[PDB]
């Protein structure tokens, strides 16, 4: 059974694009793979931020992943800082990473964490003998560095690490920005009218969907055409992703209908989906004991695996073994 | 409670009389006066590529050498860096409060990079941050080092101050403890270059575990100057070799430079080198005698490492817990 590693930032406010895209895909593959979800608080601190908001955001992210359907009895979910082995391997791998490799990632006032985090990312993955890593385009370089580091270390010391591969197949749910339908909906957009977050209430959803750009076709026609009708196509894709109705089925359903009707149904569909998600979220988020047990159990599972890899790394390097 | 002393040395190369005079001598002398913690920094050692068997052996060599010098495991905490995860943990966190420019300007990074062009690695660059973590974990007040580590120590102070300014009284701001003599012992055939523990030319070096007979021969061949008549006088600019020999002699015997200058009046470099050789040969003979008793007693070295890591972990975990609470991490259950 292959091992899958995903880093979850405790700062991102997840959108319907994040959910209906990758997360929903992965919630349904927890028996197919040994999935690991690491809430990366040690990566978060490369950007200076309020301490109390970071603690809150870590717990927010945990509860939301649980709400979306990550099962802590099937998958391993934990907070990065709870497993010392990440920092330990991070340091070790620094010594097998060229300074040039970090500088060549795509000046004097930048903090060393922002410079060095790709090595920590490599450590995060390689600790768990990870086979597969779902990456977006923005972190393809980082995965390649982790593969380069793994092969370099293995060439010196034997087959200590698995060489991880990208998880290639995409979710098959297309969710674009509401005011810029050529651009994908992304959690890190400054214009939050482009996105629908998972904790938005029905009034917020109605508002943002009514502002979503369409086209000046006369008569208005609800037909799928990414080139000529980007906005209307996005609303159709969003609706299809929520309900499971095909694009041709929806095109037939909205025959002789204006964009107001489409928008009305999209908002209703999206909010119907978010209601069950939000119910589970607030239930988990307000249960301190549950979250504490999930984190404790997750860190214990992670540590047991991570320690085995780190011991092999340390033995290969030649460090004197700790005396327990 | 007593103020805290922390210092470390790398289990790589072979420790010299420079390492001893600049650091280890002070370490031994501070043990009653302060609460002392001494570390074999194996995680720093691997910033220069090590053979795995050499690294393991050198770690244990270094531990036995600390004990041979007079570091007493009943008085001081003695441990191996990699045995305490908190070093790497705090090492990562302090990267986020250290600037790229502070690290790129470091003399050691530049010198080591020029030397090891084929392995200019991120560990070598990030070296000072892990060092700051090493110090700051133990609420350290004093850090006994040689002159060459002054720049690194200064950064650790800046990091402590910067972090404290944001979060409260989390770290002590450490102070350097650099000796008046022997802070920067120089190479015997190149006295404008500091004595290296990994020199390609062994004739530059007085190794702590080297045959005393070999060391005496090296002292006799140490370069001096062309002064006519020869005069034993301290002048680093014009008499680097003679000055370095006086510095070594002063550090061994405890005698001042004015005292030695007076003592060598009417004498030349034969007397100087004879006295340097006698003093150093005697020190190393004694040192090496103790060393083998410790080095071949694996049960004792194993127990010192166990007890030391236990003591260190108690201090380090406390500091790391406060750091993690301050920056906003969810506390581990
Ligand atoms: N020619 C010389 N003359 C006088 N002193 C010298 C000479 N060469 C070296 N030293 C001093 O020896 C100590 C150990 O040096 P290392 O290279 O092992 O090791 C080093 O240079 C440290 N980075 C190890 C370290 C890691 N973390 C720490 C925290 C606190 C103090 C020290 C450390 C040092 O005090 C060094 O200044």
Numbering used by the authors:
A (entry chain A): 3 to 108, 118 to 335
B (entry chain B): 2 to 334
What do the authors say?
Tryptophanyl-tRNA synthetase (TrpRS) links tryptophan to tRNATrp, thereby playing an indispensable role in protein translation. Unlike most class I aminoacyl-tRNA synthetases (AARSs), TrpRS functions as a homodimer. Each EcTrpRS subunit consists of a Rossmann fold aminoacylation domain (AD, residues 1–85, 140–183 and 299–334), a connecting polypeptide 1 domain [CP1, residues 86–139; CP1 was combined with AD in some previous studies (37)] and a C-terminal α-helical domain (CTD, residues 184–298). Therefore, TrpRS is considered an attractive drug target for developing bacterial-selective inhibitors for fighting microbial infections.
In this study, a crystal structure of full-length EcTrpRS·TrpAMP was solved at 1.80 Å resolution with R/Rfree = 18.6%/22.2%. The asymmetric unit contains two EcTrpRS subunits that form a functional homodimer. Intriguingly, two subunits of this EcTrpRS dimer adopt different conformations. A copurified tryptophanyl adenylate (TrpAMP), the intermediate product of the two-step tRNA tryptophanylation reaction, was observed to bind to one of the two active sites of EcTrpRS. The shift of these two motifs couples with an inwards rotation of the CTD around a short hinge linker located at the beginning of the CTD (residues 184–188), which makes the TrpAMP-bound subunit a closed active site cavity and a more compact overall conformation (named subClosed) compared with EcTrpRS bound with L-Trp and AMP. In contrast, the active site cavity of the other subunit of EcTrpRS dimer remains empty, and this empty subunit displays an open conformation (named subOpen) similar to that when L-Trp and AMP bind. Aligning subOpen and subClosed by superimposing their ADs shows that the anticodon binding site at the distal end of the CTD of subClosed moves ∼6.9 Å towards the active site compared with that of subOpen. Thus, this EcTrpRS dimer is in an ‘open-closed’ asymmetric conformation unique to all the reported structures of bacterial TrpRS. A short CP1 sequence (residues Gln109 to Ser114) is disordered in subOpen but forms an α-helix in TrpAMP-bound subClosed. We found that the distance between the acceptor stem binding helices of subClosed and the anticodon binding site of subOpen perfectly matches the distance between their corresponding interacting elements on tRNATrp, suggesting that tRNATrp is able to bind to EcTrpRS in this way.
